């Protein structure tokens, strides 16, 4: 019966504040994280609510999709919501914004895999479940997507932006299946990758819930 979220970037600021709005409304969420559960976790929930898995790498992908649509049978094998927001950031020698001279091969290719390819490789994953509830899928896009900013490296900036298009190319190939898919660009930077967030969490969740049952295509910017 209960509806279902299945989150990555479950981060201080707007992970939290999203894991905290959707738990408060009587959702199950899940968490998808690199650490293993811990019983000092912030939410009360248990380990069947999350989801140990690497986002830069495929194989550890495709086995976390298989785990979540094991623990969906528990509910009609329906997903009301995915939410991409775990995004990285790398830092250059000393802590410095990494920019496009500077950038590596190995982080060109790791931040436009956890950034762009797992979201798409999740929501593709994760069809069927999303297809049977007529779920939808947020994708959290960046300022750093339009303009270039101070805290934010060259690979993040272009793989949201890359993130960007695919939330538009998603809700064209998802809609004639009855999936909704739309993103956000909080107007700050995530802190994450270092009241506002309050604000966005509230967002997601709208674009989760039956308000936004026919918006899709669209993104959200945050001012
Ligand atoms: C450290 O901390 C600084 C960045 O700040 P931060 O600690 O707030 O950032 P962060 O934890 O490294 O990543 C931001 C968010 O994205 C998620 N995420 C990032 N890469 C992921 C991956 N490969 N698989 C799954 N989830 C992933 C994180 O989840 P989890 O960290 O729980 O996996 C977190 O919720 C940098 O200096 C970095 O080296
Ligand atoms: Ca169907």
């Known amino acids: 019966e209960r509806k279902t979220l299945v ?9 939290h504040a999203t894991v905290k709005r959707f738990s408060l409304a009587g959702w199950r969420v899940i968490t998808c994280s690199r650490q293993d559960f811990s019983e000092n976790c912030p939410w009360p ?26 623990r969906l049978e528990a509910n009609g094998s329906k997903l009301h919501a995915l939410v991409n927001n775990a995004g990285i950031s790398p830092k250059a020698e000393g802590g410095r914004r990494m920019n496009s001279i500077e950038t590596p091969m190995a982080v060109w290719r790791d931040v436009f895999q956890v950034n762009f390819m797992a979201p798409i490789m999740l929501a593709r994953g994760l069809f069927k479940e999303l297809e049977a509830a007529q779920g939808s899928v947020v994708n959290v896009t960046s300022i750093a997507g339009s303009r270039v900013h101070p805290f934010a490296g060259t690979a993040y900036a272009t793989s949201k932006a890359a993130l960007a298009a695919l939330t538009r190319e998603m809700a064209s190939d998802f809609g004639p299946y009855g999936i909704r898919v739309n993103a956000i660009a909080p107007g700050e930077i995530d802190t994450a990758i270092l009241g506002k967030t309050s604000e966005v969490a509230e967002t997601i969740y709208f674009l989760c819930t039956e308000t936004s049952s026919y918006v899709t295509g669209s993104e959200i910017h945050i001012n």
């Open 45 to 70: 929930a248990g380990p069947e609510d999350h989801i140990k898995v690497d986002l830069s790498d495929p194989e550890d992908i495709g086995k976390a999709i298989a785990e979540i649509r094991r």
């Open 7 to 15: 989150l990555t970037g479950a981060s201080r600021g707007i992970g």
